[PDB]
Amino acid sequence: PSVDPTKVIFYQKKNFEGSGDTYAVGQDVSVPGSLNDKYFSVAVGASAKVIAWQHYNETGHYREWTTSQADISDIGGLSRFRVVDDDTRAISFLFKDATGGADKQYSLKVDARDVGTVMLYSNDGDEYGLVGIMPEGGPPVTTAVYVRDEHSGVYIAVGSVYFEWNKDNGEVDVVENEHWPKQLKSKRTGKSSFEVTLVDNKPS
Template sequence: MAPKVAEKSADFYDKQNFEGPIHHFALNAVSHLYPKKIVDVYQSVNTGVGAKVHCWHHLDYDGRHAEIEGPNADLKAIADLTCFSIDKADTQVIQFNFVDKTGGNPKDYSLTLDLAGVGRKILYSNDGPDYKLAGIISPSAGTLTTAVYLRNEKSGVYLATGSIYFKWNAEKKEVDIDSEKFWPKQLTHERQGPTKFLITLISNKAST
């Protein structure tokens, strides 16, 4: 049986099955272990009912993402991940994959996102199959607004600026893009899962 843990925190252990020294992390704590992996340092974790652990492959919140809730006696399932954050239990990670359908080369275009609580993230077109962080939303907090800048990396010209409004759909248990009003016309979006979207560049003409 897993030991008790405070409601809004996570306890990591040096060994499997919650054995060895305990390392306590409170809500909003962030740990970047690169070049080590999480499993190089911790072997099990138990989260409180009010907390969730978000784990990432890269220290800048890129690459594969995994969520941990409750007792996990063995962390082998996240063997390749290197950093984690302790967030509220209801938080949801929004992810984008940005593809170019205008005929450009990989990374010809960038999508810069200003993320609340995280900072600026840059996604490049046709940069592989991984979905990248596009926001962290708490359903209880309402709408999440993210500023968007679409740029031609060859010319340095910004094709568009706009905003994305995300909202949690409690009935369907998924994130919705809440408004198209300030969505850049050069881009389309297609749902790929409850919190994942494929963003496609369909025009490389700058907004006028």
């Protein structure tokens, strides 16, 4: 339909039918099961955006709804969402391994305090994990990270990642400082998405 630009309306049926529950920018909502136990479609205000993810596990699985969606019945079991400004960024990682390991041989644990702990596995497909949410010009954030060989149990590296808003580019930047594991390389894949690659499997 046509809604308040800083609001979103979730509807019980597909194609925006029924009364709908309205939510405002700033609301963070967690449900007992999945979002689909109540909602099948969502109208998104012109200045709003929804970031939805899974708070009952550490997969980091998420979706962004930036425009009205007439069918959200098939989104995985996403169970939490935040209504944010249109220019607020979902920070996401995909974890790769260039050292010749098996699928899921390595894990990257990211202790995101806003969206919750995420456990990413190496070369485990194409689904990014949500590891933070940063408003435009938001405060910088440090998040602890842990790189482990899951087979052996041995930690390759322990450190942290520093996110900051880049005002010039209107982007999120990963700053690789002295606590960023030298064994990892980040590569930008979007305004706030990064492929993080294990380039060396020798422990610190």
